[PDB]
Amino acid sequence: RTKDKYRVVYTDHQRLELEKEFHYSRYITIRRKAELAATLGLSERQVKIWFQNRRAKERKINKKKLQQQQQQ
DNA sequence: TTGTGTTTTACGACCTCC
DNA sequence: GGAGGTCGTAAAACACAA
């Protein structure tokens, strides 16, 4: 959810907050999630998923770094 | 423009956890 | 008694050289 829009761009504000809390801890907790969702106007499920996407982004960034250590 | 390669939301299938 | 982890991918959104 939702899905009358295939997917929705989160605001610069919303992404800033999520990137900051991600630096604080890579796995959000049930309470933190509940709080962030409410302060940011997104659902628990959207935070949940965002966190899942961001750790995949990190894994993808990390493999690239590793490939660059390997070539250098 | 465009067209093509990358990044950002959302999900399904499947797995792990006493 | 279910939450939340990954992997892989669709589609929309964006970046950018040609």
Residue numbers in the entry: 184 to 255
What is the paper's account of this structure, in its own sentences?
To elucidate the mechanism, we performed structural analysis of two homeodomain proteins, the posterior homeodomain protein HOXB13, and the parahox protein CDX2, each bound to two distinct high-affinity sequences. The optimal sequences for HOXB13 are CCAATAAA and CTCGTAAA that differ from each other by the three underlined base pairs, whereas CDX2 binds with high affinity to similar two sequences that begin with a G instead of a C. Two parts of both HOXB13 and CDX2 DBDs interact with DNA: the recognition helix α3, which tightly packs into the major groove, and the N-terminal tail interacting with the minor groove. Instead, thermodynamic analyses of HOXB13, CDX2, BARHL2 and MYF5 revealed that the two optimal states were bound because of their distinct effects on enthalpy and entropy, principally caused by differential stability of the water network at the protein-DNA interface.
The overall protein structure in the four complexes is highly similar, showing only minor differences in the conformation of the N-termini, due to the replacement of basic Arg-217 of HOXB13 with the negatively charged Asp-187 in CDX2. The corresponding contact (Arg-228 to backbone) is also observed in both CDX2 structures. In CDX2 complexes the DNA bend in CDX2-DNATCG is slightly smaller due to the replacement of Thr-261 with Lys-231 which does not allow the alternative conformation of Arg-228. Consistently, only few water molecules were found in the CDX2-DNATCG complex. The channel is not as clearly visible from one side of the CDX2-DNATCG complex because of the presence of Lys-231 instead of Thr-261. The long side chain of Lys-231 does not allow Arg-228 (corresponded to Arg-258 in HOXB13) to change its conformation easily. Together, Arg-228 and Lys-231 close the entry of the channel from this side but the other end of the channel is open and well visible in CDX2-DNATCG. Similarly, the two CDX2-DNA structures also displayed very similar overall conformations.
